[PDB]
Amino acid sequence: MVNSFSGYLKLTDNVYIKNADIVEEAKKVKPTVVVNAANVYLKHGGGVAGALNKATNNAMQVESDDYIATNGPLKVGGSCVLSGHNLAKHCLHVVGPNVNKGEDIQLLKSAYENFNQHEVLLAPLLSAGIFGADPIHSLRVCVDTVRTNVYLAVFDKNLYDKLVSSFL
């Protein structure tokens, strides 16, 4: 049984990790679900969200603005399913707490629980990067929360090496 993903290191029964640009991984694999590191307003300005949105030629932002106009903002820890555009069938926009905004780090587990609604996902580490949480802590919450198959793309090589070498 051939896997659509390649080059991932298995961390647990269901969690895999790779030093890769999630945009490049999405273009290569076109997964059923790509996770975006969203904010409550779905304003995809920077980090993973800015990069995914730019890869969609801003179509993700246009769709997101219509979603917000209809539904209002998401909650920190919440998510919504929108189109994956050219990158995936769906994009699961998940809001991890942003430590730089003083958001509750306990909501990181709630954010990862959204992944359990999908059999397999291509995802970044929630609340990592510009969201300010410790990525080692995010990976621990991921492995202790997500039960579905998650393929984590870590953009930074030095961080990827540190995450693998410190994994328990």
Side-chain angles (χ1 to χ4, degrees), residues 17-104:
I17 195 167
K18 186 183 180 179
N19 172 35
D21 178 338
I22 194 171
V23 168
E24 288 310 309
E25 276 301 293
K27 289 175 181 178
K28 163 171 199 53
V29 176
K30 290 160 192 169
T32 301
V33 180
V34 65
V35 172
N36 180 32
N39 56 51
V40 299
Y41 306 106
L42 304 180
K43 285 303 190 214
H44 309 306
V48 169
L52 292 172
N53 176 59
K54 178 176 154 205
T56 75
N57 187 41
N58 210 53
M60 175 182 288
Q61 188 65 66
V62 169
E63 178 197 27
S64 295
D65 290 345
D66 170 82
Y67 171 92
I68 295 294
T70 299
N71 298 290
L74 281 69
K75 292 176 190 176
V76 175
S79 72
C80 67
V81 179
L82 290 175
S83 179
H85 300 274
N86 54 313
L87 300 178
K89 177 170 185 184
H90 303 296
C91 177
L92 180 69
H93 294 273
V94 180
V95 184
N98 184 330
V99 175
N100 301 311
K101 295 180 180 175
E103 294 170 349
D104 186 3

Side-chain angles (χ1 to χ4, degrees), residues 91-123:
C91 177
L92 180 69
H93 294 273
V94 180
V95 184
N98 184 330
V99 175
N100 301 311
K101 295 180 180 175
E103 294 170 349
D104 186 3
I105 198 59
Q106 298 297 124
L107 294 171
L108 184 52
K109 188 172 182 75
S110 305
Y112 273 117
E113 288 170 341
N114 292 286
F115 287 28
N116 291 322
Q117 301 293 320
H118 299 279
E119 284 176 329
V120 56
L121 314 90
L122 167 61

